[PDB]
Amino acid sequence: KLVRLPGLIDVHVHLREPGGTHKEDFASGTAAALAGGITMVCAMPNTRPPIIDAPALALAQKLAEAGARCDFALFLGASSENAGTLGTVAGSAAGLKLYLNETLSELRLDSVVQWMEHFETWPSHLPIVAHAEQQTVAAVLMVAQLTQRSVHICHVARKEEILLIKAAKARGLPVTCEVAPHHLFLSHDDLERLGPGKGEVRPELGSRQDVEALWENMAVIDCFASDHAPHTLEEKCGSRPPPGFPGLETMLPLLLTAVSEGRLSLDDLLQRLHHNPRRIFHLPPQEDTYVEVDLEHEWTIPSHMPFSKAHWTPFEGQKVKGTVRRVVLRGEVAYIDGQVLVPPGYGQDVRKWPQGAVPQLP
Amino acid sequence: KLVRLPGLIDVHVHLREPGGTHKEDFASGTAAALAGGITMVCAMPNTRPPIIDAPALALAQKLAEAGARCDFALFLGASSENAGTLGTVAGSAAGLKLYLNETLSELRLDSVVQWMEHFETWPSHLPIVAHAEQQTVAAVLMVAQLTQRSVHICHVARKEEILLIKAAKARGLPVTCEVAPHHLFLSHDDLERLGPGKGEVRPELGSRQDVEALWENMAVIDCFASDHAPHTLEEKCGSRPPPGFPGLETMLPLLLTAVSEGRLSLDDLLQRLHHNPRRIFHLPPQEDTYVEVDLEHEWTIPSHMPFSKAHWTPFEGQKVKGTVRRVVLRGEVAYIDGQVLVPPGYGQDVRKWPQGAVPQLP
Ligand SMILES: O=C1C[C@@H](C(=O)O)NC(=O)N1
Numbered sequence A, B: 001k002l003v004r005l006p007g008l009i010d011v012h013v014h015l016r017e018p019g020g021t022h023k024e025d026f027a028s029g030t031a032a033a034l035a036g037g038i039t040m041v042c043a044m045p046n047t048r049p050p051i052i053d054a055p056a057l058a059l060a061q062k063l064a065e066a067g068a069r070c071d072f073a074l075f076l077g078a079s080s081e082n083a084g085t086l087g088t089v090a091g092s093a094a095g096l097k098l099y100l101n102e103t104l105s106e107l108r109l110d111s112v113v114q115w116m117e118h119f120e121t122w123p124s125h126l127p128i129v130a131h132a133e134q135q136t137v138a139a140v141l142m143v144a145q146l147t148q149r150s151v152h153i154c155h156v157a158r159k160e161e162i163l164l165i166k167a168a169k170a171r172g173l174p175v176t177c178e179v180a181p182h183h184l185f186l187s188h189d190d191l192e193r194l195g196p197g198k199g200e201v202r203p204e205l206g207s208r209q210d211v212e213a214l215w216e217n218m219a220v221i222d223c224f225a226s227d228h229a230p231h232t233l234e235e236k237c238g239s240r241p242p243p244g245f246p247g248l249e250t251m252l253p254l255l256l257t258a259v260s261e262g263r264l265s266l267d268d269l270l271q272r273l274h275h276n277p278r279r280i281f282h283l284p285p286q287e288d289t290y291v292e293v294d295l296e297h298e299w300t301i302p303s304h305m306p307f308s309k310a311h312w313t314p315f316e317g318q319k320v321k322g323t324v325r326r327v328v329l330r331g332e333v334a335y336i337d338g339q340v341l342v343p344p345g346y347g348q349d350v351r352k353w354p355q356g357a358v359p360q361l362p
């Protein structure tokens, strides 16, 4: 007996196109999403070129329209040069992404004043998300308060961070956050097995106490999102390993396992992979869209999942209970039992749908 | 220039059918909803007969299907006799309503043990909402914790209540709440004008300090809902005034006025009249459904709004800025500028839609 879920949304994926298509492209990354029970993705802007201006966004939009197999929105990236220049295209993006710790030189901000400039100039009704680790969470929260608006904190990974966000919420501040599966299901205890190359990710894997704090503070977590960050095994195992894990195909099986063990409820899962993504990012419903999962099937994660071009996974060897059996996207069978059945280009930019524009005052 | 909003949801309305149709019926109450920019309502079970068993729910469902002009879900009501008897029909209802203070004899619970019995027997994945005032909020929160599930608190009206819920949320407890417009826009200061009959409502009007606490603690409020409780003027002004105010036609104009004054944002409003109702009650999207509002039009609330059979309003004389101009429901023009244009019976029970079933484990 299968369980029907709504179309799940992953608000944090790196699909590598343009410019890193050996790691992933729109067609392969969205196949991975569908196989993971995800029907809508928000793609990050740290591509090559990065999505930091209108011409780059226009290119990326067409590449996604031609390659995506599920629906999507594309983030714009903040740079040291583009504050005050994005107003005409801002509403066509998923939101604005700030990279406040390590990142590409093009996305590096060298001063908190540049963060303030972005918060002041980006349209106040549109989402802002920040990669902000440790004290950077508190710093960007300060900037958000100074500019009197909200912020969403990406991939919270530490006890320190979840407790700071908890304290901010207790003071009524408009902050939301997401947590990625590797920070719930992996820890320092796994670095022996992974090694220092495969294990490289930002935010880094936490201690057992960090992991336990995130579970204990599940009420504080608004969203789950994969931070799908595909790199090939050659890159992960080489001399200058880039940070990041692939995660689209494993996120839902890992979380369904946790549901089956009573660690969180099915509703808790659906708030975090459907309702809260919708409401934080003003993402539209998808008509005639659902995911059917089998909650009894026990399997072991293999050395690579079928679809992501990353061709490796840090969850290799973990036993899961829960599998995606069928995905229907806008009335078409998109995935059944290991086969993707919609072509590249089936997916659409949800920000172009009438219901996908963010409401604003005239 | 109009603003397009999604279809708004009111999770707390009394539509009086069956048995009180001189006060309101499905056709008139849903006309009032459409004129207020509401496209989906959840109707309470304190009708005559009350919706406390499967035959009563079946009757109410058919009356609503025949009379409703917007979409709906119907609550079941907890009684002293029905715990453990509602499992076959529970998933067809909006949720279970507990009346924990004053109410009809049929819905009166005489012991907290009866509350526990309902929390233990009602399916754990389905919503429970409680009319719970003052210390009753703390009591029902205790019952929810003892039974390890969530609860939604109706019409929070007092500083005491919002601060208790605030403290519960700070401890990570699964509680949500709603606030009605009369508790944000009226206070004791208005009882002189209203008089003791018209002014009767439960929860009663608060002090200025209660009102100010609700605004200061807007972050704690998950939903707005009208508690549309129509009674005729003869009843409100007579010897045994029933509590309650009509509110469907005035809720959105009052709140749009507050948005225009900067008291909350458009997003704050839409979280509370759209996204959070959806996610707390697992209500489905409505395809091709939107509301167009004019934010510049200043008007004064008259002695009665056009549609509710209550034929009076406690907001008479208040100046508002904001008006509903057009509602489209599932591809049909449902309301324009003072005229409802869909007939009785256009509305549908959203719990019968495939996307309107609450997900559950097998
Ligand atoms: O911040 C980031 C970005 C990401 C990437 O590879 O794009 N991978 C990571 O591990 N952290």
Ligand SMILES: O=C1C[C@@H](C(=O)O)NC(=O)N1
Residues within 6 Å of the ligand: B014, B046, B131, B200, B201, B202, B203, B229, B230, B242, B243, B244, B245
């Ligand atoms: O609890 C309630 C119910 C309602 C009604 O009239 O049905 N009116 C009120 O004022 N409070």
Ligand SMILES: [Zn+2]
Residues within 6 Å of the ligand: A131, A154, A155, A202, A203
């Ligand atoms: Zn990041």
Ligand SMILES: [Zn+2]
Residues within 6 Å of the ligand: A011, A012, A129, A153, A154, A155, A178, A225
């Ligand atoms: Zn993120």
Ligand SMILES: [Zn+2]
Residues within 6 Å of the ligand: A012, A014, A044, A227, A229
């Ligand atoms: Zn990322």
Ligand SMILES: [Zn+2]
Residues within 6 Å of the ligand: A278, A279, A281, A282, A283, B270, B275
């Ligand atoms: Zn929205």
Ligand SMILES: [Zn+2]
Residues within 6 Å of the ligand: B131, B154, B155, B202, B203
């Ligand atoms: Zn009530």
Ligand SMILES: [Zn+2]
Residues within 6 Å of the ligand: B011, B012, B129, B153, B154, B155, B178, B225
């Ligand atoms: Zn209620």
Ligand SMILES: [Zn+2]
Residues within 6 Å of the ligand: B012, B014, B044, B227, B229
């Ligand atoms: Zn009520």
Ligand SMILES: [Zn+2]
Residues within 6 Å of the ligand: A270, A275, B278, B279, B281, B282, B283
């Ligand atoms: Zn739901």
